Design a protein around this motif. Structure first.
Motif, PDB file in Angstrom:
ATOM      1  N   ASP A 112      -1.504   9.533 -16.470  1.00 45.82           N
ATOM      2  CA  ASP A 112      -0.231   8.917 -16.012  1.00 45.82           C
ATOM      3  C   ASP A 112       0.658   8.715 -17.247  1.00 45.82           C
TER       4      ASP A 112
ATOM      5  N   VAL B 173       6.177  -2.368 -14.698  1.00 44.94           N
ATOM      6  CA  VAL B 173       5.744  -2.429 -16.126  1.00 44.94           C
ATOM      7  C   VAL B 173       5.672  -0.987 -16.638  1.00 44.94           C
TER       8      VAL B 173
ATOM      9  N   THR C  18       4.809   2.289 -18.417  1.00 47.77           N
ATOM     10  CA  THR C  18       3.603   2.850 -19.075  1.00 47.77           C
ATOM     11  C   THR C  18       3.935   3.067 -20.553  1.00 47.77           C
TER      12      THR C  18
ATOM     13  N   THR D 196       2.959   5.444 -11.790  1.00 47.71           N
ATOM     14  CA  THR D 196       1.852   4.463 -11.925  1.00 47.71           C
ATOM     15  C   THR D 196       1.545   3.834 -10.562  1.00 47.71           C
TER      16      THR D 196
HETATM   17 MG    MG Z   1       4.020   4.118 -15.509  1.00 50.62          MG
END
Ligand code: MG
Ligand code: GTP
Ligand code: NA
Lengths: 19, 995, 121, 209
Positions: free
Chosen positions: D58, D33, D35, D17
């Motif tokens: 992603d 954080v 995904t 990410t």
């Molecule tokens: Mg991610």
């Protein structure tokens, strides 16, 4: 011999000058 | 709108599912995100699998069917053995039925490979559960079914390929040891039947797509099948002849022959040796006639990247390197195989010219293997003289900078062997390349740099007299090249390379003092050059030459009035006047290296004080000004000067270690006074401006001073030889200056370098200052734990240094933990268990190591009230916290250390090394041994943590685990079998009898 | 940029203030250029990211703009931009631009003031 | 506008990410954080052969946040497998990610990426990274943090998908920007938003830039 002296002489004149 | 499918009350609207799926795959923006959340919640519905045969029958969307099989897969791998046996037969029959259905329709078979391959993978998940015990006829029927249809035969090769992958290649993690052996034994039992069909198809050669699929399956079989299936059949002739001529089959065939070259083979059989030669001869023959001759420009072919040429050339490199690494000796004795040997090597030379870093690394591993052999194995070099000569030019023309450590190391190693094998050829190639820089034919900044790195790499391989004539020829030619060129840009690049080569040839510098002196005085001239990179190059070269030649700077050379170190120190102000501070620190470090060579104490201390003159006079000035007025210190210019003085001391201390004591003694008292003054200023700014002050330039400046003081003290103590002076002179003033300041600052004003510094102090002299170690714990333990015990992210530096500090205290001064009040000792145990649950591996590894060392520290105490109270309070906390991270799937990086700690904890009870009952009065009968109670506690703990396991599974797991607790590798196997069984329902309890 | 003259070129990291998130976000690292248009004689900042060469600052050096210090840096400037067109239509941003050194930052602001009083004409 | 689906797969925490965010806006996200399932971000590059658009899927490294898992791979035209050079387990799981990927996508260009090479204590050494060789993956050392080789996975895939090995990233000519014409109504509003900006410290103030 003399050619080690020639290396020393030549190394001394090494420079970085804009032309 | 779309959230209808999530309502399981009604029959599933297929057309609604198909819009949800379609607006996910072909949709965009907010709609596709909404569909994504809907599809996720759909498949995660535990009953979703019930609505699977519907979707496969009534949906026309291939993506809907794919997701339906994924829902099925998740059920088969996790919940299969919980199902009634008629659901299991149902699912098997409609997966088989869907596959034959899609194979019989040529349109569907052509156009939906994704959905068919997914169906095959689902069938294989069922075989892993049901075959061969509840499906004995699967293979006989698969083999018979293959004769009916080419499409079914092709799909059967894909099923067998996936089955081979799932059993032999990917079983280790995903199945119990027992289940892996069972499936391996079953596949090899029936492989005879499977191979016949494989070989039949390949010989009959019906269809390329069927042949590519058969060869794909064969590539997987070659990872495990016995060598006889390859050598006692005609298959080597097929792979190495007919399948190398077609480009469809050639890609996969070459991969197969690469894995054939890796088969386990009897090494004393002349007929098998001839078969190994023959398939190589056939393969190389097909390459030469069907693909490209030995002379082809593979660099150009690879660069053009037409079709699959790049993959093919990657696979040819892997095939030749693999085979020749294992078998080149088979080709070296027979004169008739000489041409085969050199053509195969000539292909590798051409492959070695491709511009592709990762392919070059593959060919360079082989060249290493070869030239290593030519250097030791007798009567082998003459064979390869033309290969090695071409290789010399390939390594040299593709030389990388030393910064690329691995590639440069690999390249240097090969080029050094190739220099040993023919010095004259190496010298000629390098002088000729140099001439092509001088005449401008190959002149480039990159080209002269490459050549410089190459010439530099072979230092110390030639004889001293050959090296002398070579070095002189190269330097004179590079000096002439520099004179010839115009502009600071050109002359700087050549001057760097001159200086680079000289630095690489220390043996030459040691033998010729006049030249060494000239070189150094020239570096001093370049330290005044403002042109980008020259001052860094001059300083880097300076310390590099000094590391290697230090002895020549500290003695008096016969034609000199004094040791040259003295000359360097006199003109140090003038020499470093134009350098940035970091460059000046390198320079001083270099002088420190030379001064460490002086073994007369009086003379070393005199050179040390001579060298530290400028920083010591700047220092004396700044303490006088700083003691008179604390306001003057707040000025930026004064903070930068002070930080640069301390950094100069760190630099010289780094290279002198124990020898730096007299200089540390000279500044120590006023430095710890300055540390306190600067501490106050920081706290005062945090008071007037808030926490934001810690981010202002001037507070960051002040904190740099504190960090560089702690770095200086850490650096000295870490290398100190006189530990009595460390204790009696350094430590008490240090603890009084830093500990209280740390404790009484707000968390954001605390320097983690305090913890780092204290770690070193405890490491070197912990044994001599037990009251000092207690003072360190009292001062940093509770307030640091409070900073780091709320989440896993905040104060990352403090977090890591905190557990290094407890680790070393637990190793060297355990007594300090015995002195803690019980409440604080409980926090110590909480803090270790806290470390376990970290992902950050620096914390996690120290966590488990403290736990293991603490258990052993308590063991060593023998039967004593503290060891007894520790076990009654903390033993089961440690077993259950270790079990928590072993089984939660979020700490798999720490499996080895978790396993070792658990084994140590279980072995305590099974050696009766715990003297007290672990149970509360009237929790169990009066006699009961700790062994029995451990079994009950663990049984109950695992039953509550994993309620889907049977009592039989838990009991068996624990009987195996506890009896295997003297044999780590087997223990680990049982733990891994348990990690597989918690992932599913109905795990066979007998699997824990594997060992 | 074939009909524009470079007045100043310095390496810099550019940041954008996300007011909602209450933090600075990197927008790009590369050569920040002061480009004088041959036609209008208007000087702009054009900044392209290294390697990708994507535009991360494209606006007029407006005479209204004021370079302020950032509390955390001796080598950065903060200023409101009312119309940057790096990432589509003219949008308003609070920029921060950090440099290799304090002197790079000081020479930037002096060059930024030169350009402001070229944009006055 | 040539449009290609890119699946990004690999263990949780490898920087998939962070890598995408760096390409989308230029920001470096310090916070982790996880995904949930997949995030689709359109990504456009300017080349000598014209603009190339990647629809970047992603995917989630963590098994609990896995979602559709191999469902995300359907009709992918290219892929990046990501691991962390500081984490030995992330490299050990590369064959698992590749296995799941190639089953759905039989014949696509794939880049193997070792992220976080900026970190000094490198656990996965260059010498031991050999998985790509028999699988015909391009391999890059990258750092989302330092931008070391950050463009190279996308340049390599661009060259493969367009089928031009001489394809390169180019500067698009920069449009003349408009005059400010600042309005006094928002004068007070900017005054306030600029004060908050000045008094929030710029991140990473010890970095070279
Ligand atoms: Mg991610
Ligand atoms: N030092 C360093 N940290 C990085 C780098 N790239 C990412 N990180 C950090 O790694 C963490 C995880 O990054 P993410 O992109 O969220 O990880 P991910 O692979 O998307 O994780 P999942 O979504 O769970 O699959 C964050 O704290 C990032 O700031 C890098 O190049 N260097
Ligand atoms: Na070298």
């Amino acid at each position: 011999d003399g050619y080690i002296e020639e290396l020393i002489r030549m190394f001394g004149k090494l420079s970085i000058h804009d032309d | 709108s779309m959230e209808g499918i999530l309502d399981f009350s009604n029959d599933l609207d297929i057309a609604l599912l198909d819009q949800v799926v379609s607006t996910f795959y072909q949709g965009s923006g907010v709609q596709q995100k909404q569909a994504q959340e809907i599809l996720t919640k759909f498949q995660d519905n535990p009953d979703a699998w019930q609505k699977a045969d519907q979707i496969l029958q009534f949906s026309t969307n291939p993506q809907s069917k794919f997701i339906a099989l994924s829902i099925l897969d998740k059920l088969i791998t996790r919940k299969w053995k919980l199902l009634p046996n008629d659901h299991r037969i149902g699912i098997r029959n409609f997966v088989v039925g869907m596959i034959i259905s899609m194979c019989q329709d040529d349109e569907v078979f052509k156009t939906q490979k994704n959905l068919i391959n997914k169906s095959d993978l689902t069938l294989v998940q069922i075989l892993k559960q049901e075959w061969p015990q509840n499906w004995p006829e699967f293979i006989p029927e698969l083999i018979g079914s293959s004769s009916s249809s080419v499409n079914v035969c092709e799909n059967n090769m894909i099923v067998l390929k996936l089955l081979s992958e799932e059993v032999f290649d990917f079983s280790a993690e995903q199945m119990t040891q027992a289940k892996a052996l069972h499936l391996k034994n079953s596949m090899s039992k029936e492989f005879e039947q499977i191979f016949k069909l494989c070989f039949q198809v390949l010989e009959q050669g019906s269809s390329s797509s069927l042949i590519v699929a058969t060869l794909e399956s064969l590539l997987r079989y070659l990872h495990w099948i016995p060598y006889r299936y390859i050598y006692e059949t005609n298959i080597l002739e097929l792979l190495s002849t007919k399948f190398m001529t077609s480009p469809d089959t050639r890609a996969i065939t070459l991969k197969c022959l690469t894995e054939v070259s890796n088969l386990k083979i009897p090494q004393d059989n002349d007929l098998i040796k001839r078969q190994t030669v023959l398939f190589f001869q056939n393969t190389l023959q097909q390459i030469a006639t069907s693909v490209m001759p030995v002379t082809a420009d593979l660099k150009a072919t690879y660069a053009n990247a037409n079709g699959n040429d790049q993959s093919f050339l990657q696979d040819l490199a892997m095939f030749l390197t693999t085979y020749l690494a294992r078998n080149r000796a088979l080709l070296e004795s027979d004169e008739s195989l000489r041409e085969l040997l050199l053509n195969a090597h000539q292909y590798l030379i051409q492959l070695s010219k491709i511009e592709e870093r990762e392919l070059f690394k593959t060919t360079l591993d082989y060249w290493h293997n070869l030239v290593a052999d030519l250097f030791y194995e007798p009567l082998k070099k003459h064979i390869y003289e033309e290969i090695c000569s071409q290789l010399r030019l390939v390594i040299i023309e593709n030389m990388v900078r030393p910064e690329e450590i691995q590639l440069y190391k690999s390249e240097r190693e090969v080029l050094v062997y190739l220099t040993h094998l023919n010095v004259i050829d190496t010298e000629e190639i390098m002088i000729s390349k140099l001439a092509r820089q001088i005449d401008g034919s190959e002149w480039s900044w990159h080209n002269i740099n490459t050549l410089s790195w190459a010439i530099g790499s072979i230092s110390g391989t030639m004889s001293e007299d050959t090296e002398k004539r070579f070095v002189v020829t190269v330097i004179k030619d590079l000096l002439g090249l520099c004179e010839q060129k115009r502009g600071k840009d050109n002359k700087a690049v050549v001057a760097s390379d001159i200086m680079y080569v000289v630095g690489q040839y220390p043996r030459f510098l040691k033998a010729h003092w006049n030249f060494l002196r000239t070189v150094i005085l020239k570096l001093f001239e370049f330290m005044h050059e403002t042109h980008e990179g020259v001052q860094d190059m001059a300083c880097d070269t300076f310390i590099k030459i000094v590391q290697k030649c230090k002895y020549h700077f500290v003695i008096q050379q016969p034609r000199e009035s004094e040791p040259f170190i003295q000359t360097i120190i006199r003109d140090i102000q003038k020499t470093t006047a134009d350098l940035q501070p970091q460059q000046v620190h390198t320079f001083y470090k270099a002088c420190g290296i030379i001064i460490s060579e002086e073994r007369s104490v009086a003379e070393r201390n005199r050179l040390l004080s001579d060298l530290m003159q400028l920083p010591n006079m700047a220092w004396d000035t700044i303490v006088e000004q700083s003691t008179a007025n604390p306001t003057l210190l707040l000025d930026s210019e004064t903070v930068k000067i002070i930080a640069n003085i301390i950094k100069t001391n760190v630099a010289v201390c780094t290279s002198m270690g124990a020898d730096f004591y007299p200089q540390l003694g000279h500044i120590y008292y006023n430095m710890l006074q300055l540390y306190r003054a600067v501490s106050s200023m920081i706290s005062a700014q945090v008071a007037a401006e808030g926490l934001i002050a810690t981010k202002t330039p001037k507070v960051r400046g002040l904190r740099t001073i504190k960090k560089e003081i702690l770095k200086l003290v850490e650096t000295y103590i870490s290398k100190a030889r006189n530990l009595d002076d460390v204790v009696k002179v350094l430590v008490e003033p240090l603890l009084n200056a830093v500990l209280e300041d740390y404790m009484n600052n707000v968390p954001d004003a605390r320097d983690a370098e305090v913890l780092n510094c204290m770690t070193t102090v405890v490491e070197k002299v912990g044994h001599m200052i037990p009251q000092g170690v207690i003072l360190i714990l009292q001062s940093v333990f509770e307030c640091t734990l409070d900073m780091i015990n709320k989440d896993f992210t905040e104060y990352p530096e403090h977090r890591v240094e905190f557990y290094k500090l407890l680790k070393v205290i637990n190793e060297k001064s355990f007594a300090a933990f015995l002195e803690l009040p019980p409440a604080a000792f409980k926090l110590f145990v909480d803090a270790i268990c806290w470390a376990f649950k970290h992902n950050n591996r620096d914390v996690e590894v120290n966590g488990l190591q403290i736990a293991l060392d603490l258990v052993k520290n308590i063991e060593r105490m023998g039967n004593v009230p503290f060891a007894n109270e520790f076990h009654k309070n903390y033993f089961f906390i440690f077993v259950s916290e270790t079990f928590f991270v072993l089984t939660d799937s979020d700490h798999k990086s720490g499996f080895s250390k978790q396993a070792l700690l658990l084994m140590k904890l279980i072995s305590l009870v099974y050696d009766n090394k715990i003297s007290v009952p672990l149970y509360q009065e009237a929790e169990v009968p009066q006699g009961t041994s700790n062994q029995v109670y451990l079994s009950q506690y663990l049984a109950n703990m695992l039953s509550n943590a994993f309620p889907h396991l049977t009592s039989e599974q838990i009991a068996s797991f624990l009987s195996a685990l506890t009896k295997q607790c003297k044999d780590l590798v087997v223990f680990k196997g049982t733990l891994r079998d348990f990690l597989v069984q918690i992932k599913e329902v109905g795990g066979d309890p007998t699997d824990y009898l594997f060992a | 940029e074939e009909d524009e003259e470079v007045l100043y070129k310095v390496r810099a990291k550019l940041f954008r203030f996300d007011a909602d998130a209450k933090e600075w976000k990197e927008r790009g690292t590369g050569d920040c250029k002061f480009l004088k248009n041959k036609k209008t004689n208007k000087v702009r900042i054009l900044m392209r990211r290294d390697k990708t060469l994507k535009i991360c600052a494209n606006h007029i050096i407006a005479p209204e703009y004021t370079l302020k210090p950032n509390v955390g840096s001796d080598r950065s400037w903060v200023y409101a931009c009312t119309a940057d067109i790096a990432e589509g239509e003219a949008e308003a941003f609070t920029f921060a631009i950090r440099f290799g050194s304090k002197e790079n930052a000081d020479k930037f602001k002096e060059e930024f003031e030169k350009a402001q009083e070229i944009n006055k004409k | 506008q040539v449009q290609f689906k890119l699946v990004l797969v690999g263990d949780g925490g490898t920087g998939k990410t962070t890598f995408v965010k760096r390409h989308l806006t230029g920001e470096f996200e310090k916070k982790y954080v996880a995904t949930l399932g997949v995030e689709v971000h359109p990504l456009v590059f300017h080349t000598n052969r014209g603009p190339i658009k990647f629809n970047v899927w992603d995917t989630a490294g963590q098994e609990k946040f896995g979602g559709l898992r191999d469902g995300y791979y359907i009709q992918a035209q290219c892929a990046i497998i990501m691991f962390d050079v500081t984490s030995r387990v992330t490299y050990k799981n590369v064959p698992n990610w590749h296995r799941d990927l190639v089953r759905v996508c039989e014949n696509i260009p794939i880049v193997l990426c070792g992220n976080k090479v900026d970190i000094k204590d490198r656990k996965v050494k260059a010498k031991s990274i050999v998985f790509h060789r028999k699988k015909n993956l391009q391999y890059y050392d990258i750092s989302a943090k330092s931008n070391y080789n950050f463009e190279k996975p996308f340049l390599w895939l661009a060259r493969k998908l367009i089928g031009d090995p001489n394809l390169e990233f180019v500067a698009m000519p920069a449009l003349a920007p408009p005059e400010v014409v600042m309005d006094p109504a928002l004068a007070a509003q900017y005054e306030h938003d600029l004060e908050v900006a000045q008094t929030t410290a710029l991140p990473d103030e010890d970095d070279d830039l």
